[PDB]
Structure formats: structure tokens, C-alpha cells
Write an enzyme that holds these catalytic residues in place. Sequence first.
Site, short mmCIF file in Angstrom:
data_model
loop_
_atom_site.label_atom_id
_atom_site.label_comp_id
_atom_site.label_asym_id
_atom_site.label_seq_id
_atom_site.Cartn_x
_atom_site.Cartn_y
_atom_site.Cartn_z
N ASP A 1 0.77 -1.39 0.02
CA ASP A 1 0.01 0.14 -0.09
C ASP A 1 1.06 1.29 0.05
O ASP A 1 2.00 1.37 -0.79
CB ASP A 1 -0.81 -0.07 1.19
CG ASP A 1 -2.14 0.74 0.98
OD1 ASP A 1 -3.19 -0.02 0.74
OD2 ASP A 1 -2.01 1.74 1.13
N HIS B 1 -3.50 5.50 4.62
CA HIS B 1 -4.14 4.61 4.10
C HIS B 1 -3.76 3.29 4.39
O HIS B 1 -4.17 2.38 4.63
CB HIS B 1 -4.50 4.76 2.55
CG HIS B 1 -5.36 3.53 1.70
ND1 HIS B 1 -4.73 2.35 1.60
CD2 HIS B 1 -6.53 3.72 1.46
CE1 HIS B 1 -5.80 1.73 0.77
NE2 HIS B 1 -6.92 2.54 0.78
N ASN C 1 -14.38 0.28 -5.19
CA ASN C 1 -15.65 0.77 -4.77
C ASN C 1 -16.43 1.67 -5.81
O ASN C 1 -16.69 2.74 -5.69
CB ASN C 1 -14.91 1.86 -3.51
CG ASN C 1 -14.09 1.03 -2.86
OD1 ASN C 1 -14.48 0.25 -2.07
ND2 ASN C 1 -12.92 1.86 -2.60
N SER D 1 -11.28 -1.30 0.69
CA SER D 1 -9.96 -1.08 1.18
C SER D 1 -9.75 -1.58 2.57
O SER D 1 -9.01 -2.39 3.05
CB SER D 1 -9.33 0.16 0.95
OG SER D 1 -8.76 0.26 -0.25
#
Length: 279
Positions: free
Chosen positions: A39, A69, A161, A224
Site C-alpha cells: 500500500d 491509507h 468501490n 480497502s
Amino acid sequence: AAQTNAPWGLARISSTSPGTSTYYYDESAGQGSCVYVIDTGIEASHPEFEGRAQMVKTYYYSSRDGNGHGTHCAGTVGSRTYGVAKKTQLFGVKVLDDNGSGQYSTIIAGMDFVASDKNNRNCPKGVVASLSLGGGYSSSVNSAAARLQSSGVMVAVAAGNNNADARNYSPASEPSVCTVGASDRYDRRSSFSNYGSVLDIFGPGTSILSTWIGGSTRSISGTSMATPHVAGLAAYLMTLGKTTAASACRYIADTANKGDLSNIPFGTVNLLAYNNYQA
Ligand SMILES: [Ca+2]
Ligand SMILES: [Ca+2]
């Protein structure tokens, strides 16, 4: 073990019904396993990681997570208070810049890197890779995810998403990995969650509290957030010896809560990650 007043997502994965606030889990808590969080990086110094996290590779100027994140996802995988597998070893691979973006070539490089790097790490119970990222369909990205899975790593990827069929996104559309959709606290498919025949399982993804940079915490939503729940669950089940990297996804689906979710399109599995814990 039981964590009272736990984040709803943790409570949900250890319950057959929604609305509970206690996270029941086995004390082994994923120790012996390793989870690579590919990530934006991980703020390894965060107290919540208790020294169990470390950056192993960066494709940018620094290994620091300047976004948050990655730290949030890592937190759901194995931070003390917000994680599924509270004793797992976390390895950060920064393939996304501090704006949360990355090109497919470095994302692919990051996956190939993990396939090799795991060979020099001590992960007795298995290796998991959590990929809370994705973009448009790419056969090369799918191939990289397939290679990582084939190399002996349990690959969990976000479904996306876009409230659309995940077949048009990568690495979500790679059949051989574990594609994760998101649900909310009332057992509804998260409004933003992708769906489709390629999804393998659903996990808590709406309003998920976890670690953030600057030694803080934050609640955010997305597939996520659902992905690390299953990645952590996989690490947890693997150290428990219930499954292996090659079949963890199938095992999670086989033991999932079935038919609990609402607003699931025909053709999409109605399976919610469940740890089947019994004290
Ligand atoms: Ca139920
Ligand atoms: Ca699959």
C-alpha cells in the site's frame, strides 16, 4: 480471548449476527504468520503495532507512509486495538505514493518482490498479502496477482468501490486470488462495494476505525477496509492451522456466514467473513 467495546467490524467477524460489540478470538492471534501490506506504507512506529511492523521495500524516495491509507489497512490486519490478527508480523511494501496512487508497473514489481522476499523471512505459519488497491482491468496486473498466489502467498484484494461488476477491475478480476467486497454494520452490502461472480467473500468495510499516521486513529470506509479484515482472518486461521495459503480463500467462503447480507445482486455470493470462534 475477548475484546470488549471493539470496532464493529471485529465484532461482526466473530459473530453470527450483527449488532454485537465484543470481538471473540483465539489468543494465538496470528503469531507466526506474516502479512505484507502492499500500500502507501506503514507508520511502523505507531504504538498500536507494538514493534511488530516494519517497512521492507519502497518504490519511492522514502519508506514513510505520508498518506495514512496503508497504516489504516495494516491496523485492521494486526494492530493491538483495531486488528484482526493482533500478533501477526506486518511488512510494509510501499507501491503507492503519499497521494494513494501508483502505476501498474511498480504495483506489479511490488507483488513480484513479495513473492521473492518471503523466502528470506521467518513466517512459520504462512504468508498473506493484502492489496487494498486496484484500477481498470489489466491482464498483466492480474497475472502478477496470480503469480504471487501461485508462489504460496494468500492474496486478498479489494473488489473495488465503483458499485459495479468487479470483472472490469484488477487485480479484483483475477479468479485465483481472494476478491473482497464490503458490508456495513446493518449487514447491507456497502453502497460503494463492487459485486459480481468474481467476488469470493464480503468483509466489514463501512465506518472502520483503525490506526492512522501521526500516532492517531481514524474511521474510513471502502473495500480497502474490508480486504485487511479477510487478510487478517486468513493469517489468523493459518496460524490456527485450519487452512493454508493456497486454500484459505475457499476455506473462508466455506465457513462464512451465509445469506445474512441484504442488497446482494443475483449472481454474487452472499458470504460474510466469519472466524467461527467458540470459547
Ligand atoms: Ca446470521
Ligand atoms: Ca477468487
